[model samples]
Target: TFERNKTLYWGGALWSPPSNWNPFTPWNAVAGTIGLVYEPLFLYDPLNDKFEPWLAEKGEWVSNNEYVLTLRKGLRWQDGVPLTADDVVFTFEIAKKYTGISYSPVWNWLGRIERVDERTLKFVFSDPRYQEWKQMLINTPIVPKHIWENKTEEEVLQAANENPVGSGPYYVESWADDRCVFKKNGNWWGIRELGYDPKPERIVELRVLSNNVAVGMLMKGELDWSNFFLPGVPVLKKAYGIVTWYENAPYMLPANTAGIYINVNKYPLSIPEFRRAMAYAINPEKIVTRAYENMVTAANPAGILPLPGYMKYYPKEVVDKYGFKYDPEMAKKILDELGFKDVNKDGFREDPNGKPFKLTIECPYGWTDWMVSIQSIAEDLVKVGINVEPKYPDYSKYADDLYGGKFDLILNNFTTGVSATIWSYFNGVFYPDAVESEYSYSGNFGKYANPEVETLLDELNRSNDDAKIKEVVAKLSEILLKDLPFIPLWYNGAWFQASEAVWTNWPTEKNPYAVPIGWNGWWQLTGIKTLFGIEAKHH
Candidate 1:
C-alpha cells in the first residue's frame, strides 16, 4: 500500500506537532499532514487551473450563483460508516458556530452548505459566483459525522486530530514525539493505487527532524521532500541530489505584504504629514535587496499592488501630494512641516507638543530577516531625525497587544487568500464591514476609523456593478495610498527546494489537487510520482 513502505521526510523550521491534529484546529502549518489521510470532494487542479472533483462524482453550477456537487456514493469513513452530504453540512455548521480562525472566513462568505440529498450539496453565497469560496471546499477536508455528532465540537475535532479516522488511503496508527506512522486503509477505495489496499499490510512512517538538520538529512538521502519556507534558504540551495525549484510564484496567488501600521488613535501618527514622512523615509528597493535578498517584489511605495492592468484608485494627485520617494530629505521636510523638529543636541525629531517621535515598531516571531530589515528601517528614519525603536516578540504576545492598538507601529506578514492580499490591508482594517477572527488579524489593527475609507469599503462590497466595483476599489486603494495608513514594504515570494532527484524533472505546472509549489499543496505531493515516476507503495 502507498501508506506503507513509502514515507516522505518533509522538513521545516517550526515543528510543534500537537499530539492531536485536526484541520479545524489551529491547522496552518502542522495540520496539513492530515491531507494524506483524508480526501475532499473537489480539489483545485493546478494543471487545468480549475477546481477538480476528487471524492465527488462530478460538480457543476446548478444556478447562477450556486455550485452543486454530487459526492461519490457508497464511500465510507475509515470506521466503516457511509459518508453523506449531511456529514459535510454538519462539519461546516460546527466550524461556523465554533469561535476561532479556522472556519470563520468560509462562514463569512457562505453561511453553510445546503444538503440537497444523500449525495448532493449546494453552496449559497451572498453575491455572485465566488471562485475562491469554491476553493475552500477543496482545502477544507471533511470529518466523520457519525463518530463526532455525539460529542461537542471541541471533542470531535480533538478526537479526529489525536486519532484521525478517514476514508483516504491511510489511517494514523500512532503519533509519537518525533514520528508518525500511517497504516494503509484496507477498505480504501483508492486501494488499487496503493498495492496493499487489499491486504493493508505494512505501515509508512514520517520522522521528525530538527530544522537546522533538515537540509543535512535531505543531502544524505534521509529526506525526500523539504521546503525552505520552514527553514534556512541558503542551506536548502546546497542539498546535493535535492531539487530546488524557483518560479515567479506571483503575489496574486496570495502573500503577506510586510508593512508598517500606525495607531491612528495616537497623536503623532494621527498627523498626516508625519505618517507621510514615515512612508517616504523607508524605501522598498533598499529593503527588498538588502534584507530580502531581492527575493521579493518591490511594492509601489504608495501601497498600490503591482498587478498589471488593474484599475488602481489611489488618486495620482493624492499620491503626488504625499508620495515618499525614498528620500531622507523629503522625509525631514514633512517632519518639519508637521511641527516636529530636532530640538535637543541628540539627533531625534520632537513633535509640536515637545514629545520625541520615538515610537516602538513591533515585529512578529519566526519571520526570517525581520530584525535586519526593520533595523534598516529604523536607521533610515534616524537619518530623517525620527526616533524609531524596533520590538520583536513571539506571535502570541504580538497578536494580543498589536490588535488592541498598544503599539505605535507594526511589521507583520499576512497570508492572503486567492483573490487579493489587499483584502487584509484595505478591507480587513479600512473596510467597514470586516470581522476579526483568531486567524485574521489584519483588519484595521491600528484601530483606524476613517469615515471616507469605511464608506468606500462598504460601497465596494455592496455595489454589484463590476465597473462600479472596480472604480470604488480603485478609489479606496487610492485613498489608502494617499493616507499612508500603512506603508506596504514588499510583495513576498514562495520558495521551495526539492533534491536534484526530484527537481531536474519537477513540473512547474499547477497541481490537480490545487496544491501550491511548497509544503503539502497538491502539486508537491503528486510531483513526487508524476515528475519522477516514483510510485507510492500502492501505485
Candidate 2:
C-alpha cells in the first residue's frame, strides 16, 4: 500500500471529519472535493494570467452581454455517463435556486443559460457592464446532471454524498475513522486524451491529526504532503528531503488578508477620527513579530492586501496624505485633540460624552496567533490611554457572535481567488447594506457603510479597463485610509509543504504553477496542475 502503489499520502488539519460532501456548503465540503471531484469550465493560472481549457474547449463573448462556451469533445464522468451542455445548464439552474454557500452570486449577472447544442452552451447577461463574468465562469464547479437531477433539493442538501462519482481525476474508494482513500479514476478522460497522466496511483487524505503526529508521519516517509504549520522548517529541510513554496521566512504563498475588524456600530468606534487613531495606536509590526514570529509581513498602511501583484493598486499618494502613522505619541495626541480625556483619573480615557472608553477584542480560543495579536493590540492601545480587554471564546460561538454583530471588535480575514484586486474584498466586507442591521448576514460583519466607497466599488466592478480600475482603486484607497473600516494587520500565509520522496515539480516561488495548498478552492486546480507534472521518485 505504501511503496508499490505510487500513492501520495496527505495529512490535513480539518476541524473535523467531513460529513457533508456538497461544495456549495463552503464549510461542510470535504478537502479535495470541489476541483478534484468536479471539474470547472477552465483552469486559470493567476501567476501567468493564462487559462488551460478543461471541460471547456473555448469560451468567447459573442455579444455585448452574452458569452458562448464550447465543451470539449469526449468528456465523460467517472460513472461512464457522457458529459454534455445539458449537464452544464442543469448545474447552474440548480446553483441559482439552491440555498447553500457557493459562487451563486455569479447567477445574479446571468439572465439565462441556453443549450445551443450537445457540446455548446450560451449565457446571456442582463447587464453589459458586468465585471465578474470571467471570474464567475472560470471558478464555477460543474457537477454531473444525471446523478444530481434525481436527488431532490432537500435530499441533495442533506445527503452526505459519501459514495461520490465525479468526472475529475480521482474518485472516492473507501472511508473509515482514521482516513479516507481516493483512487485515481482510470477512466478519467483527461488522463490519456488530455495529457493529464500523473505519477500517483492513489490519493490518501489522512484524518485530523496533531502537528507532531503529522510531522512524525512525514519524517517517516509515510506522508508526501501535510498542511500543518511546521515550526522549525529550516531545520526540517536539512534532516528530511522536504520542499515548500518558499525557502525563507514567510514560507508560503501570499494570499488572504488578516485584519483587526472593527464593528462600526459600536460606540467610540463609530467615529472616523477615533478609528484612525486606533489604527495608529495598534502596531501591526508588533503583532507580526510577536504573533507570527516574523513569518508574515506587516500589512501596508494603504489597506490593499500586501501581495506582490496587489501593491501596484495601492495608491502611494493616498497613503502619503491620509495613512495613519504607527506612533503611540501621535495616537495619544489625536485622542487628546478629539476631547477623549482622562477625566476620572483611571488612566484610561473617556468618550466625548464622558463615558468610559473600554471595549473587548475577541478571537477564537484555539486561534493562538490571533490570541497573541489581540493581547499585543490591547497593550498598544493601553499605551494611548485606551482600555482594551482581550477575550477568548469558543470557535463556534466566536464565529456566530462575529457575524451576528455581537462583537465590538474581532479578528477576521478577507477573501482571495483568481485575482489580486481589492474590489472583491470591499464588496464582501464593506457592502452598504451591512450597516443597516446588527445581524446583517452579509460578509460585511463589521457593519461599515459609506456612500462614496459604495459608489467607487460600483464603478470599479463595472469597468474592464485596467486604467479606469486603477483610478477607481486609488479613489477608494483614499477613502479607506480615512475611514479605517477595518485595520489591515498582516497578509495571511497560504501554508503549504510537500516532500520530494514521492512527487516532484510541486509549486514553488520560482515556479508557482499552481497554489501549493490543497484546502480551499484554488487547491483543486492546483492539485490538477501539480499532479500532471509530478514525477514519481525511485529509491
Candidate 3:
C-alpha cells in the first residue's frame, strides 16, 4: 500500500546527510532549512503581486522615509519565549555587524530602526531603494534574540544551530544520510492569527542523488512533489497521472531569462557593432523549439517578463527600433563594415589588425539544454565567418572561468525572479560598475559601462511613484536595447512537478494561490505558504 499517512515526500533538493542548520552558512545547510525552522516578517507572492503578513501583522509607510511594523500578539518560539519587535531589530543589526552575510548591503541605505514598543518597530531610510526594501521584508529571516544574543561573532556566522528555538510552524524532527524530516509545532501562531494549518503533519525532504533515481521514484508514486528536471515527462504523465504547472508542452511557468553574456574586455566582441551582429545571428526560436523541446519561450529584448503584472513594462517603442532577429546577411555586413576579413584564407574573418582569433563559448557539460543552446549559437555564428567553438567543461572550471571573466561568451541567468520588474534586470546588468577577480552575479563580470545608465538606475531605486518608475525604466530600456551586453535567449521554466496520490490541490494555473517552486531559497521566498494550500487525499 502507499504511505497513506500525511507525510509529504519531497525529492531532489537535498543530496547528502544534514549537519549544519545555520542559515548564514548556506553551503552547509539543507534547502529551505532556515525558512521551515524560522520565518520572515512578510511574504511576497509575485504570482498575484501581493504581500502577505507573517511574523509582522502589517507593515506601513507612514512618511516619506519612515516605515512602521506592527507585530501580532501571542507569538512564541519553540523554547517557550515570546517573539517581539526587538528580535526583528536584532536580525538587521547583526546583518550589519557581519557584512559577509547575504543581505548585508541593505545597511548601506537603511538609516536606523527603533523599537517603539514590544509590538511595534519603526525604520527610517536615508537613501531608499524601495524595490530592494520590498524584497528585504519577505526574504530576511528574523532570529530569536534571546537565543542568539550570547553567541560570539564567529558563532553568529558559522556555528551550528541544531535544534535552535524557531518561530516557524515546523521543527527539525530528524535527519539521516539520505533524508531530512520536520514535524509540525503545536504552538505555531499562524493557526490562530492567519487560519493556516498545513496539511502535512510531517515533511520528508529526500536526498535524491540522481535525476534517474528521482525519475524512478516519481514513476512509482513514491514522491508527492519534485523539483528535479526529469526527462521523458510525457511517459510519466501517461503512466502515473503526474501533474505539472501546465498540462501540455512547456510544463512549467517561465521563471528566469537565460542569456549569452559577452565580455567587453575581450577584443572584437567588445565593439557594440559586433555584439549587435551576434545578437542577430542567434535564433531564439531555434533554441526554444529545437534545443529546449518548446519548454521555454523567447525573452523580450528589454528583459521584461511576460507575466501578469509585469507584462505592461515592455518598452515596445525602443525595442521596435533596436531589436534584431536571425539574419546572416546583416551579421556578415556588420563584420564587413568593421574591416574584419580572412587574411589567412581560413574561411573565418580575422580582427582589423590581421590577428586571426577564435572565440570560445562555454557552458557546463551536463546541463543538456544550455549545452545545446551554445552549440546551436556557435553553428549560426560560424555561418557569418565568425570563428567560434563551443566548449563544455565541468562546473568547477566553468564557474571559475565565468566569475573570473576569462571567457569570450558564457551562458548565464543574470538577475532572475525579482519583483522589482525591469529595474532589477537593468540594475543587475549595469550597476556596481567595478573591476574584481570575482564578479557579483551582476552581468558586468568584466565589461561594459555607461554614465546615463548608472544615473537612471540610481534614480529608479530611489523612486516609489509608479509613473516615475516607468518613465525612468523606459529610458533605461532604450539604452539596454542599444547596447546588447547580454543577449536575451529564452525563459527557463520553474522546475516543479507534483503527484496527487497522497496530496491534492497543489498550486496550478487555475488556482494560482501559492508559490510551488522547489528551489533552494524558496524557504526565504514563499515556501510554507504552499503547504497550507495543499490538501491530503481522502481515505
Candidates 1 and 2 compared: the better one by TM-score is 2
RMSD of each: 5.6, 3.3, 3.3
Scanning candidate 3 in windows of ten residues, the lowest lDDT window is 433-442
- Compute each candidate's TM-score over C-alphas: 0.75, 0.87, 0.88
Encode model 3's per-residue lDDT on 301-387: one tens digit a residue. 876778856566566777888777778889888889998888887789998899888999998755666777898999889888899
Better of 1 and 3 by TM-score: 3
lDDT ranking from best candidate downward:
3, 2, 1
Candidate of highest lDDT: 3
Q: At residue 339, what lDDT does model 3 achieve?
A: 84
Q: Please, what is the whole-model Cα lDDT of each candidate in the order they appear?
A: 0.57, 0.73, 0.76
Off by over 4 Å in 3: 1-4, 12-21, 25-29, 147-166, 172-180, 207-213, 339-349, 354-356, 363-366, 385-408, 418-420, 433-448, 521-525
Query: By summed lDDT, which 10 consecutive residues of candidate 2 come out lowest?
Result: 414-423
Off by over 4 Å in 2: 1-5, 98-104, 150-159, 174-180, 207-222, 306-309, 337-358, 362-368, 389-406, 414-422, 432-442, 510-512
Q: How large an RMSD does model 1 have?
A: 5.6
